UniProtKB/Swiss-Prot annotation, chain A:
DNA-dependent RNA polymerase catalyzes the transcription of DNA into RNA using the four ribonucleoside triphosphates as substrates. Common component of RNA polymerases I, II, and III which synthesize ribosomal RNA precursors, mRNA precursors and many functional non-coding RNAs, and small RNAs, such as 5S rRNA and tRNAs, respectively. Pol II is the central component of the basal RNA polymerase II transcription machinery. Pols are composed of mobile elements that move relative to each other. GO terms for biological process: transcription by RNA polymerase I; transcription by RNA polymerase II; tRNA transcription by RNA polymerase III. This is DNA-directed RNA polymerases I, II, and III subunit RPABC2. Keywords: Acetylation, DNA-directed RNA polymerase, Nucleus, Phosphoprotein, Transcription. Component of the RNA polymerase I (Pol I), RNA polymerase II (Pol II) and RNA polymerase III (Pol III) complexes consisting of at least 13, 12 and 17 subunits, respectively. Pol I complex consists of a ten-subunit catalytic core composed of POLR1A/RPA1, POLR1B/RPA2, POLR1C/RPAC1, POLR1D/RPAC2, POLR1H/RPA12, POLR2E/RPABC1, POLR2F/RPABC2, POLR2H/RPABC3, POLR2K/RPABC4 and POLR2L/RPABC5; a mobile stalk subunit POLR1F/RPA43 protruding from the core and additional subunits homologous to general transcription factors POLR1E/RPA49 and POLR1G/RPA34. GO terms for cellular component: cytosol; fibrillar center; nucleoplasm; nucleus; RNA polymerase I complex; RNA polymerase II, core complex; RNA polymerase III complex. The keyword Nucleus applies. Belongs to the archaeal Rpo6/eukaryotic RPB6 RNA polymerase subunit family.
Swiss-Prot record, chain B:
Component of the RNA polymerase I (Pol I), RNA polymerase II (Pol II) and RNA polymerase III (Pol III) complexes consisting of at least 13, 12 and 17 subunits, respectively. Pol I complex consists of a ten-subunit catalytic core composed of POLR1A/RPA1, POLR1B/RPA2, POLR1C/RPAC1, POLR1D/RPAC2, POLR1H/RPA12, POLR2E/RPABC1, POLR2F/RPABC2, POLR2H/RPABC3, POLR2K/RPABC4 and POLR2L/RPABC5; a mobile stalk subunit POLR1F/RPA43 protruding from the core and additional subunits homologous to general transcription factors POLR1E/RPA49 and POLR1G/RPA34. GO terms for biological process: transcription by RNA polymerase II. Signal peptide: none annotated. It comes from Homo sapiens (Human). Keywords: Acetylation, DNA-binding, DNA-directed RNA polymerase, Nucleus, Transcription. This is DNA-directed RNA polymerases I, II, and III subunit RPABC3. The modification N-acetylalanine is found at A1.
UniProtKB/Swiss-Prot annotation, chain C:
Disulfide bonds: none annotated. Catalytic core component of RNA polymerase III (Pol III), a DNA-dependent RNA polymerase which synthesizes small non-coding RNAs using the four ribonucleoside triphosphates as substrates. Synthesizes 5S rRNA, snRNAs, tRNAs and miRNAs from at least 500 distinct genomic loci. Pol III-mediated transcription cycle proceeds through transcription initiation, transcription elongation and transcription termination stages. During transcription initiation, Pol III is recruited to DNA promoters type I, II or III with the help of general transcription factors and other specific initiation factors. Belongs to the RNA polymerase beta' chain family. Transmembrane segments: none annotated. This is DNA-directed RNA polymerase III subunit RPC1. It comes from the Eukaryota. Expressed in the brain, in the cortex and the white matter (at protein level). It comes from Homo sapiens (Human). Component of the RNA polymerase III (Pol III) (Pol III) complex consisting of 17 subunits: a ten-subunit catalytic core composed of POLR3A/RPC1, POLR3B/RPC2, POLR1C/RPAC1, POLR1D/RPAC2, POLR3K/RPC10, POLR2E/RPABC1, POLR2F/RPABC2, POLR2H/RPABC3, POLR2K/RPABC4 and POLR2L/RPABC5; a mobile stalk composed of two subunits POLR3H/RPC8 and CRCP/RPC9, protruding from the core and functioning primarily in transcription initiation; and additional subunits homologous to general transcription factors of the RNA polymerase II machinery, POLR3C/RPC3-POLR3F/RPC6-POLR3G/RPC7 heterotrimer required for transcription initiation and POLR3D/RPC4-POLR3E/RPC5 heterodimer involved in both transcription initiation and termination. It is found in: Nucleus; Cytoplasm, Cytosol. The chain holds residues 945 to 1043 of 1390 of the full protein.
Length: 79, 149, 99
């Protein structure tokens, strides 16, 4: 098993992961960080990504039907 | 005494291409000790330079003979008698674009230096050994004084 | 300079991109070296590193520490210059001729 995909984290997947985490944290989810006093869980959803503490696995599908598993902690976040 | 350069110059031409600004003018100078072309800009409102005059130009750092090099400049404080009170024109700029003469394609030894005093440009040309310091990045104080004889 | 560049280029990280970009940067790194020799025999300078005129070494100075960061930065910019997988190229190109 060897990965044939770019390791850089796309913005298309970054946005969807951020949205999923923001929607899940607002569902009375256990936080993976000690947050400051602040509302709008969308604002703190980026904090977990900056600290690489998001338990989400990205499954990339190929045209043939091949599945590739990637970790948010394994991806490279660049900005 | 950290003197980087010092000489006596004479103004040959001044503002040759008409006039554009109302407070700044171009200056063309020359020397007798070492052949060199000095070009700079000085304020006319403060320092009214005329044609055919001899002045003394000194480029150096660390005004105070006491301190090695100080952190921040204070305007009215005079703890250490510096070289600025003896002269009559002070500038503080930095050097950039260290290039030489390109006309002589084969062996030459003529080097040039550009200085920017926060907008006002200064060009120097001359000998290689005459320019002893003049590093690429250096904060240098310019000192000018009129010599009327 | 040539041996240092081609020694630092043959690494485990640099063998991930197209060799066309590597030849394109080899065309530029080689051309910078020809600019240095003409300036060095212009005034007369020995490269052993002992000549009492000290300013003649400040015209075009290239040190091996700052040349590695340049290569790393350009190679990393070539990584981000690649188009992201998943972008809508049809809709993007459809409006480029609109305005």
């Amino acid at each position: 098993q060897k990965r044939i995909t770019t390791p850089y984290m796309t913005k298309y997947e970054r946005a969807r992961v951020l949205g999923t985490r923001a929607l899940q944290i607002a569902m009375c989810a256990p936080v993976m960080v000690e947050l400051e006093g602040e509302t709008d869980p969308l604002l703190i959803a980026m904090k977990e990504l900056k600290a690489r503490k998001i338990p989400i696995i990205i499954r990339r599908y190929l045209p043939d039907g091949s599945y590739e598993d990637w970790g948010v902690d394994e991806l490279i976040i660049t900005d | 005494a950290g003197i980087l350069f010092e000489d006596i110059f004479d103004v040959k031409d001044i503002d040759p291409e008409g006039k554009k600004f109302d407070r700044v003018s171009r200056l063309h100078c020359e020397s007798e000790s070492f052949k060199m072309d000095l070009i700079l800009d000085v304020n006319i409102q403060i320092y009214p330079v005329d044609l055919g005059d001899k002045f003394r130009l000194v480029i150096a750092s660390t005004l105070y003979e006491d301190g090695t090099l100080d952190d921040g400049e204070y305007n009215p404080t005079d703890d250490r008698p510096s070289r600025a009170d003896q002269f009559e024109y002070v500038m503080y700029g930095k050097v950039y674009r260290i290039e030489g003469d390109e006309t002589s394609t084969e062996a030459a030894t003529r080097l040039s230096a550009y200085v920017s005093y926060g907008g006002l440009l200064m060009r120097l040309q001359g000998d290689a050994n005459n320019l002893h310091g003049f590093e690429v990045d250096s904060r240098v104080y310019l000192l000018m004084k009129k010599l009327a004889f | 300079l040539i041996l240092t560049t081609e020694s630092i280029m043959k690494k485990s990280e640099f063998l991930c991109c197209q060799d066309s970009f590597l030849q394109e940067i080899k065309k530029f790194i080689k051309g910078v070296s020809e600019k240095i020799k003409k300036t060095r025999d212009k005034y007369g300078i020995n490269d052993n590193g002992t000549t009492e005129p000290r300013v003649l070494y400040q015209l075009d100075r290239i040190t091996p520490t700052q040349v590695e960061k340049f290569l790393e930065t350009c190679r990393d910019k070539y990584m981000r210059a690649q188009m992201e997988p998943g972008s809508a190229v049809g809709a993007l190109c459809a409006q480029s001729i609109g305005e």
